[PDB]
Design a protein around this ligand. Structure first.
Ligand SMILES: Cc1cc(O)cc2c1CC(c1ccc(O)cc1)=C2c1ccccc1
Ligand SMILES: Cc1cc(O)cc2c1CC(c1ccc(O)cc1)=C2c1ccccc1
Lengths: 230, 8, 230, 8
């Protein structure tokens, strides 16, 4: 039972810290770029779990629901983050402050370029809409949450975060109609993010089985998504 | 481990 | 340059007519149920193309864009329609007025039951939200459209339909805030529909290669989606 | 055919 203004601040406080990784000394190859990505991701996944647990009410869901939600949305959340980080840097993908990939660098890994392009396209769209930080916080949480006691609780949590986004938009002062248009515009983009994550997951699974990159521990568990698949 | 981390 | 009220009416007039198919005399088997579905779908796909062309501005897009849009969203649109038709009939899937499948009938085809359940779940959600007909019209068009001259035109068309939905919701008279909440609620559901269509497409491709059902003509072209894949 | 139908 918390107001939207209060939930936004809570989300702000829950934001994961920046993961610092750097380009390898030697130039990139398919294998080393992928390696860097998996190393970055494993650290980010750890942070994602901590973030999730700071979302009011999340830990009250069934453990089964908590696992399924994270297993289904993780790549999408990682991508949403990457989009935010890259928002003011056209043509670039800011995976990490010191790991900034240029679009063309996608050529280093077979089939990643078209996905990078998808990523840059959606990022461009968010930039043109002038996505605000607080809006991003709400949307990111929305991605996790939109992915009987526990069901009831989840629906309530999704509603809370939705209400927060509505609140954030309303403080901009624009007309009711433009507020609605903005909201729709943002949510509509979300399907583009989901799409990118679907292609990213497919691609990553390929990279793994083509033994281009080794996938272990937390990343592997989440990628396999055994609990989610049942 | 995702399990350990959530149960934590 | 048409008002939202006018676009809604245009959409209403563009609604495809009902496709009438019936259960086969003999009880259903995996093969005959699938057959019925493909026969129903091929007719619906023909109607879908006609509908699409009645959407103001659609025919002005590049032919390449027109093809790609329909190839990417068709299953999702078919499902959205099925959801609308089934909305007041819990536990049932109204594929056609005279082809009403009970949930349990999903057992007839390997792996379709879980998808049916997904379908029924999202349908239930739309029912609980009391989705109105005019809202459905807008959302359905949104699914197609959200899936440089042509790009520009498309963005404008998507905006027009979005604005129509906003307009439809505003006529309900509820508060600005509830109007926003309703809009979000509806759009959020859309990802559930997309998800169902992704699983449906996968399943259907399986049924085809396991030679359970023959897939021809228009359906095959759309399922293969060669133009879309490039 | 989807092509024919759109070009129509
Ligand atoms: C496009 C693509 C293709 C692909 O095969 C893999 C990935 C990506 C993006 C991406 C990513 C990583 C970190 C981010 O913060 C944001 C995106 C990953 C990736 C790699 C290793 C582990 C997990 C995810
Ligand atoms: C769940 C599932 C699994 C599957 O393998 C196929 C289908 C479906 C649903 C579905 C459908 C058909 C008509 C509708 O109006 C709404 C949905 C089809 C289907 C069959 C043949 C051709 C095209 C689509």
């Amino acid at each position: 039972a918390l107001s939207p203004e209060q939930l936004v601040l809570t989300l702000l406080e829950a934001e994961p810290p920046h993961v610092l990784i750097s380009r390898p000394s030697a130039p990139f190859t398919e294998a080393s770029m992928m390696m860097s990505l998996t190393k970055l991701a494993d650290k980010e996944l750890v942070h994602m779990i901590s973030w999730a647990k700071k979302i009011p009410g999340f830990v009250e869901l069934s453990l089964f629901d908590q696992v399924r939600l994270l297993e289904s949305c993780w790549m999408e959340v990682l991508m949403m983050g990457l989009m935010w980080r890259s928002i003011d840097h056209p043509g670039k993908l800011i995976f990490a402050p010191d790991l900034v990939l240029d679009r063309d660098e996608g050529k280093c890994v077979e089939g990643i370029l078209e996905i990078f392009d998808m990523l840059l396209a959606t990022t461009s769209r968010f930039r043109e809409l002038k996505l605000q930080h607080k809006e991003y916080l709400c949307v990111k949480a929305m991605i996790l949450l939109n992915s009987a006691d526990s069901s009831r609780k989840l629906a309530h949590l999704l509603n809370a975060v939705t209400d927060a986004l509505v609140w954030v938009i309303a403080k901009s002062g624009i007309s009711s109609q433009q507020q609605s248009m903005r909201l729709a515009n943002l949510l509509m983009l979300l399907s583009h993010v989901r799409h990118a994550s679907n292609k990213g997951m497919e691609h990553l699974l390929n990279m793994k089985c083509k033994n281009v990159v080794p996938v272990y521990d937390l990343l592997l568990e989440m990628l396999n998504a055994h609990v989610l698949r049942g | 481990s995702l399990i350990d981390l959530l149960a934590d």
